[PDB]
Amino acid sequence: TKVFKLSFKTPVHFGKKRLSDGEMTITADTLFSALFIETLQLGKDTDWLLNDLIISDTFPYENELYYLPKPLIDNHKAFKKLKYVPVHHYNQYLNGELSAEDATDLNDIFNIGYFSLQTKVSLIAQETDSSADSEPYSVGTFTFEPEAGLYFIAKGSEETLDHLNNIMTALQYSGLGGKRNAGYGQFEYEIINNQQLSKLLNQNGKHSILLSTAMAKKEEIESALKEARYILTKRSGFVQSTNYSEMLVKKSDFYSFSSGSVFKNIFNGDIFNVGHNGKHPVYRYAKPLWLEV
């Protein structure tokens, strides 16, 4: 049940719909994509990690502090402006022990980077030929302070996690974002076991908080939504090397729960096929990683 720490040193581009967009964090599906591509690139076996690994979302950290997504459990004006809650207060959050002034101070302290729209041009056009207009475009980047970054949670047996160690060691030289081949998004990592992370991960309760993006299988959906509080977010995009035309290849739309979901009845997930008229399957990750409180 190890955790992984990542520091970047260079701005990163994650984005939501367009290149003008800048986003702080990415999803378990993007990282499953990265790991799968790197395994196929290294020439190893994907069988072991297709159906033995459970991954969580990316999360921010600061100097000696950790954050987790807001669970969907009087002021009703300050909490709505909050996205992440510190670990030390996580239990205190679920018992109603957090006050408005404390929350406001939290909002004050939570600056972990900034945003920037870098403008560029393209002269590969008939500018090579003759008079032709230039094409200014814009990329969006996020930049970290020297002591902030990302962390992940992974669990299973020792063998699978040794494989994961090797994969991260290889991966730390490629990137985790958009314009990777343009100079964005490299990192260095460390393997950590914090005590309080293990304490939260090993609770005992009646509800469950989701730390990933997952979808229920057919035969269980009717029993999954008995008493639930969730968010559906459409996830679409383009593929990397399915067929001839990139434009003619675009993933079929998918809907999945978000990362603050609370479920009274657990479900196992599945790795879902979102391919059609392609040569090889295109997988979306959907398998939940719970914390039971």
Binding site: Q41, Y114, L123, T143, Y173, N181, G183, Q186, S241
Partner: protein, 193 residues
């Protein structure tokens, strides 16, 4: 499967002007206010020069991936940053990091002149850089490195940035180290100058 890292430094011989903000405003970081050279700049200038020299080589090394055939990039160029040696030396000698140049323009038929300002990174500074190469085909590394050497030569005898026909941008490359960072491929014999 192996990954190779080429590291070194670039020195500014005559004043440099990238100026993404403008055109005086030179690109920096918005917090530390230190000049940098974006990797898109280097990638584009090298692409233009090497294409002018000559195709499948530019396509295998920089990647096209929409022309009806899909080729994935094989060389990754990162941003460049001010080095510690230069910061220490400049802080001791009490030198600013950036210059401001005043220029003028003359009207034909009217002989009236009007001014300009161009902000420009100082002479003698240094930047640190790293490139990554992903060895996807064993029988091609010598060819790819010949081509990358030619590109660095051409960029050495040319300019980076804007206003180079009037005297800006000239750079040099020093202190190269070529280490194999993932895998077991022998890259203790390569050279890039």
């Amino acid at each position: 499967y192996s990954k190779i890292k080429i590291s070194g430094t670039i020195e500014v011989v005559t004043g440099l002007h990238i100026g993404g903000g403008g055109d005086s405003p030179v690109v920096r970081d918005l917090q530390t206010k230190l000049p940098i050279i974006p990797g898109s700049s280097i990638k584009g200038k090298m692409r233009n020069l090497l294409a002018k020299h000559f195709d499948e080589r530019v396509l295998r090394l920089f990647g096209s991936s929409e022309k009806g055939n899909i080729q994935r990039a094989r060389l990754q160029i990162s941003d460049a940053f001010f080095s510690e040696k230069t910061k220490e030396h400049f802080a001791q000698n009490d030198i600013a990091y950036t210059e401001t140049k005043f220029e003028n323009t003359i009207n034909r038929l009217t002989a009236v002149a009007n001014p300009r300002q161009i902000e420009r990174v100082t002479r003698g500074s240094e930047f640190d850089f790293v490139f990554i190469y992903n060895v996807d085909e064993e029988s091609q590394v010598e060819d790819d490195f010949e081509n990358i050497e030619k590109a660095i030569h051409l960029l050495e005898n040319d300019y980076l940035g804007g206003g180079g026909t009037r005297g800006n941008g000239r750079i040099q490359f020093k202190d190269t180290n070529i280490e194999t960072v993932v895998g077991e491929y022998d890259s203790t014999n390569l050279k890039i100058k």
